[PDB]
């Protein structure tokens, strides 16, 4: 069983620029673990599988969250630290292109369709339960949990937005953009580490370790 009510509850329960951005990322990794434990059935997976799923998904999970947090922000993002970061600041820090991808492919699209918190929660749970994650002791089990989330999401969309038959597909079709953006943000982060100027705190640094 995978009730959207429980997923919404998980979201509600947890509610230069590059230095501040990395600080926010590290901060939210702690909260991300708290979020995942509140998603039905996650805590009952083997510990090693919970580790695999969070290591695979954390960046996409956190990016989805800050993007949705930013829907009422004009040309910017709102960090978990309470700092608003504008386009101009990202551009003047040498990270304009990737910032603009976040704005155009995620934030603006979330804004334009008025993606709600239940929908965001469900998309994040789908990302969490990624059965393609390498090393899972039982991928089939994770696949089944993903299937339950998306079944519940579709039923939710059909019930709440009956006049929008395309909405469920529209939600799912932001996931390729999220995947690509997560990968690019990760690439930048490895570079920040490599150059060694930008402070990277312990949890964020741990996520940059090899498996």
């Amino acid at each position: 069983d995978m009730p959207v009510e429980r997923i919404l509850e998980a979201e509600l329960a947890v509610e230069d620029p590059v230095t501040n951005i990395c600080q926010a990322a590290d901060k939210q990794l702690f909260t991300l673990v708290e979020w995942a434990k509140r998603i039905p059935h996650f805590s009952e997976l083997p510990l090693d599988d919970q580790v695999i799923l969070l290591r695979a998904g954390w960046n996409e999970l956190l990016i989805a969250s800050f993007s949705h947090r930013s829907i009422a922000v004009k040309d910017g993002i709102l960090l978990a630290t309470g700092l608003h970061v504008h386009r101009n600041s990202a551009h003047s820090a040498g990270v304009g292109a990737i910032f603009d991808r976040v704005l155009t492919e995620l934030v603006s699209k979330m804004r334009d369709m008025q993606m709600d918190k239940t929908e965001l929660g469900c998309l994040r749970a789908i990302v969490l339960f990624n059965p393609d994650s390498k090393g899972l002791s039982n991928p089939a089990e994770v696949e089944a949990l993903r299937e339950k989330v998306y079944a519940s999401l579709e039923a939710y969309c059909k019930h709440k937005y009956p006049e929008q038959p395309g909405r469920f597909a529209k939600l799912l079709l932001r996931l390729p953009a999220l995947r690509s953006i997560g990968l690019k943000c990760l690439e930048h982060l490895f570079f920040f580490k490599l150059i060694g100027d930008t402070p990277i705190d312990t949890f964020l640094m741990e996520m940059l370790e090899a498996p």
Binding site: V51, F203, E206
Partner: peptide, 10 residues
């Protein structure tokens, strides 16, 4: 991955 394991334990 000691931080993640510790947090997921409790």
């Amino acid at each position: 991955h000691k931080i993640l394991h510790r947090l997921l334990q409790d």
